[PDB]
Amino acid sequence: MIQEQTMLNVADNSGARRVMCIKVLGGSHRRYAGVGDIIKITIKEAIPRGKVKKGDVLKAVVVRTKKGVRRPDGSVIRFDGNACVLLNNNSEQPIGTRIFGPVTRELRSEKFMKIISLAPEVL
Amino acid sequence: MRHRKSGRQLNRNSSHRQAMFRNMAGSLVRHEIIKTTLPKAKELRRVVEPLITLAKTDSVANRRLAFARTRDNEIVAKLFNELGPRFASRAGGYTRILKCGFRAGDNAPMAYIELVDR
Amino acid sequence: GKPRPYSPRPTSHPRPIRV
Amino acid sequence: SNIIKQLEQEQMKQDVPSFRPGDTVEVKVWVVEGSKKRLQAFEGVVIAIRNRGLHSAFTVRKISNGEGVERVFQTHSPVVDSISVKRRGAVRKAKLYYLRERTGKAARIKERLN
Amino acid sequence: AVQQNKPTRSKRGMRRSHDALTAVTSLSVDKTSGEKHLRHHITADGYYRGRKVIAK
Amino acid sequence: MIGLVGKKVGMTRIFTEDGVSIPVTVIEVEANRVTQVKDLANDGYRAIQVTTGAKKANRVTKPEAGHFAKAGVEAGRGLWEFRLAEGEEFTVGQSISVELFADVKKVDVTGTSKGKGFAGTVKRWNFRTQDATHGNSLSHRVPGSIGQNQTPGKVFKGKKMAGQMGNERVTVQSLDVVRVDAERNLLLVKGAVPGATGSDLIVKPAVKA
RNA sequence: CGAUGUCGGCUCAUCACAUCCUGGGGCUGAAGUAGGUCCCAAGGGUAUGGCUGUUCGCCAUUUAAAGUGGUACGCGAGCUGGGUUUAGAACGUCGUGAGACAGUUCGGUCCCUAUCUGCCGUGGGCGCUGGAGAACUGAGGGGGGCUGCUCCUAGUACGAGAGGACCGGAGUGGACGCAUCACUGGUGUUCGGGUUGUCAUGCCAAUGGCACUGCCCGGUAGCUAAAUGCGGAAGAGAUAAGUGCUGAAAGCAUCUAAGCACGAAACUUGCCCCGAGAUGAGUUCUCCCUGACCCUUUAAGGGUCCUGAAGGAACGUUGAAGACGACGACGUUGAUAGGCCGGGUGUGUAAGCGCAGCGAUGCGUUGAGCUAACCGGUACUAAUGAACCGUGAGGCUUAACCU
RNA sequence: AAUUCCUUGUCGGGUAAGUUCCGACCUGCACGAAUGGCGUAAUGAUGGCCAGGCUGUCUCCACCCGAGACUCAGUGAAAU
RNA sequence: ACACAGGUGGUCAGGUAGAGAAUACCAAGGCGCUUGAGAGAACUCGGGUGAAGGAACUAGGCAAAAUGGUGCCGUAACUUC
RNA sequence: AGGACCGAACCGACUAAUGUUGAAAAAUUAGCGGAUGACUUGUGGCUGGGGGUGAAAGGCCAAUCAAACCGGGAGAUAGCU
């Protein structure tokens, strides 16, 4: 349950460590982004030598949230800290070659298949 | 809204209510009949009758529970010596409320609340 | 009749200034 | 009431083992990919149990690849295949939410002996 | 906020058209003593439904 | 076609074999006895009057008793009417059961919504609260402006304001019928319906379907 | 000018249409995609941030779109008080000076208990023609009406390629609305527990008070959103711009004059709610009352005796009903409330006793004890015999049937 | 610039985005040397700006505890 | 002007905890503040708690939340040392 | 040692909310500044109205201040309402 100003950790090796959501895409007055939803992010913290720089404006897919995801039987899956995977402005494909930590069954699309394959565990 | 809620507030805070019903429970057990406001009498039924119920089984534990409530060994003793065997075969309903007009000072609806075998 | 009027007393709000 | 009870007693599992808050259970849940239907194991500490008949639930917390993960299972759900207590924990609380603000040697429970 | 015009004795009357008291429908008569009393209330001498419940 | 009168027993879930939890409202639809048939000649429209449940003989007034007596049916907790389509036809006494919904896929459930009493504009009309701080004087949950100036110099009819909320007739349309149990006289519909537990529900086949 | 509070914001709007989006069209220097321009269309919808008092504007990033105006540049007896708009102070500047500047700078107060209109709710009265309990009809009124993306049709039509449809169908979202509490959660000073200081219950042990519920950890019912069900429609009628058919006036031509057809989120319906004070007061079903007598200004007259129905009210126990009224349930031929019994739920293994330990404490008895608003039961308590209101066959005229 | 009208000057810093802030520049509308000039550690319920922490300030409110509001009895105002 | 939450100099100074005349709970002693009774709507006031987010609020973090004790360790620019 | 530091009494009054026909003609509540000094406070004294006093705000001089209050000139005058 991510909104404008929300600070997300990075679940990839892009070099970005802390990113801030500056928009929820895909609707007028859209409040929140859950697991799977694409957000617009600015990079607040990054490693010195990386694929992305501090202050860069790009897209990210939210892959873990504290609010978590609900399954059809009523079950819920909650994580400790919100994390996202950085995507391009044009293509919306991952920058990184390695995703860190687990992901959910909500990324099982035709759009985030790289973020499933490179995942150690899919909860 | 107060849907399905129990327990009258009686224009008091929780601590005051608890203290007042502790005193008024002792008063009823001591005198066997008292005159109070009708709503206080209806609430009192939910404080005294469990104490009488509790006082059907005479143990150290139950006397300490009934002391934890009431806080008077003149009331505890009477609950476990006099009232306990008295209502032994009676399945609840130890108290009778009798409406008795209106208080002079504030036109409060008044009632007597007495133990049934008084 | 009418009672003697009071001396000025504290006022809650400033008169609006129109200028 | 008796009608809802008579609806909530026929959907109810009869093979739900005894587990307590602080125990380490292994919940095996069904994962569905179109045709194939396999069992995925989720193992961690039982931090909360909701006893509410058919609506019963329990919350299992594990540290999966650095990031802490809490799964709230619906006890009588057909997606939960098997529950199995791997370790019995000695705690004094019903709810172990305090385990959320601990990591390493601090987030350890003493093994209950009979 | 306050009236711009003095309301009439007529308007005053109309507002008080709902102020009239309702007299007790009727008094119950105890079976033993014979006293009139408020229904579901004890009598003045202390009877309720033919039973002497409180002494004086 | 016609609907049935039921009682909201409460809400449960149905776990499906494919591991999905369907939230269900349990509607107790016991035998609906037709107490009167309206025609075009006498009454002036086609409908049946249904009763359901049982009621205390002493509580049943003589103008209600006679009405049931003419129909030759035991008194129910009330009377409801259902309009007929051109093809439909029922008789006096005829006990209609929940088997009526056997093939019906979606229903409309009408009930008396829970009473919220006197509700503010924030709860009733989703009005936005004003600043909690930043100097706000006694105007945190108040409605704000209720009109414009000298033109029009009045508040318009239908102005959203504080007042009675809920305890009114509400219809939730196009609820999936999950199960129809004729033995236990139960109708299970997917999702929530209006009213408290034990409240009267009128259940009709989907008007939109 | 014996005062009509002035910018911007906030809250809440409401109308216009010169239409921003969505809908329907004509022309195109319209291949397609996408545009341009004009016509019709006001149903619904119509950004969040950075900077600034700003409106605005610039910028960032969205969106189907971020419309233009009116409404005392809508809205301070609704909020704010940053700007402006007193008294303090300073800078630049002007002036010998007091002072001054639509130059700047720091500081600087926002009253009103609502009589009337209006509006949102909710009752009482009387009416509706004998009285009464229900169920209705629906005049009329209100609510609702938004839209993205993906997939199929189809890499088809079209195009040199690049690209890439109409029409039709399917799925899944955003925003908004209604309902609900099964789930996920919040709350839960009425449940359980931990714990600090202190005071008390003679003391030990065990408890209670007070310290924001002392501080906390959990949490039942209820209420609830972030939770999860559902909604916008399809269809129909009459149309707008527009498109036609047949067809003269005008041997031709011509959508029009006669006649005929199609045509949109606008209109009338369809969906949801209110609704017979709809005084034009409607309908249907059922229930109740089938006494005597006297005076007179002989009237739809008054009065006495007898009678008091159906139904209602009142009172009581009350309710997921409620400000109060109201509304619903129940009143012994009784589960209406409280208690009580069983269960559940929550807390988490009471007290006492025993055992181990020097002791704090641990272990056993023991998942113990306690457990609100919950579930299922149960007349133990309180819902009383009465009394009270309401009557006694219901006007005239004229028809059509009946005798 | 507590002084700059033009002006949100220009360039850089900080921010995704900075009419404010900071640093330079000098084109000082209209600084300037005891109506002192320029610095200055410390001090400040002083003005401006940025962070960390923190949060119902806000997204967007929900529930709860109390005092009013509501009903009954007693007393009983006011502006106009 | 009131049996008015204001103002009014000196003296006395118990216990437990505490650095303390702070603070909490008490003693001696003194009080419950001269309308009560119900109810448990909106809204106002004074408080408590809050999912996810964390200044996006706003003129401005206004208000709130937060920090908070003792000992030891450790402590920058700058400086009139 | 100190117009030194933290902090009650005591002196003050930066912010906010409340209150605004108030509990109060300037307060209350929560925070806030000083707290051995250019400190604060009791009692009494002195300064008088174009005069006082003023770490200077035209501040204060009995709820009154760009000339106090009371009585008098006085029925000032009022081309104004």
Ligand SMILES: *[C@H]1O[C@H](CO)[C@H](O)[C@H](O)[C@H]1NC(C)=O
């Ligand atoms: C009340 O008005 C007087 C003038 O008559 C003063 O302006 C005073 O400062 C005002 N007070 C408030 C609080 O506005």
Ligand SMILES: [Mg+2]
């Ligand atoms: Mg109840």
Ligand SMILES: [Mg+2]
């Ligand atoms: Mg009171």
Ligand SMILES: [Mg+2]
């Ligand atoms: Mg307390």
Ligand SMILES: [Mg+2]
């Ligand atoms: Mg006069």
Ligand SMILES: [Mg+2]
């Ligand atoms: Mg006037």
Ligand SMILES: [Mg+2]
């Ligand atoms: Mg009145």
Ligand SMILES: [Mg+2]
């Ligand atoms: Mg209600």
Ligand SMILES: [Mg+2]
């Ligand atoms: Mg808001």
Ligand SMILES: [Mg+2]
């Ligand atoms: Mg104010």
Ligand SMILES: [Mg+2]
């Ligand atoms: Mg406020």
Ligand SMILES: [Mg+2]
């Ligand atoms: Mg007019």
Ligand SMILES: [Mg+2]
């Ligand atoms: Mg005037």
Ligand SMILES: [Mg+2]
């Ligand atoms: Mg037009």
Ligand SMILES: [Mg+2]
């Ligand atoms: Mg229109």
Ligand SMILES: [Mg+2]
């Ligand atoms: Mg329409």
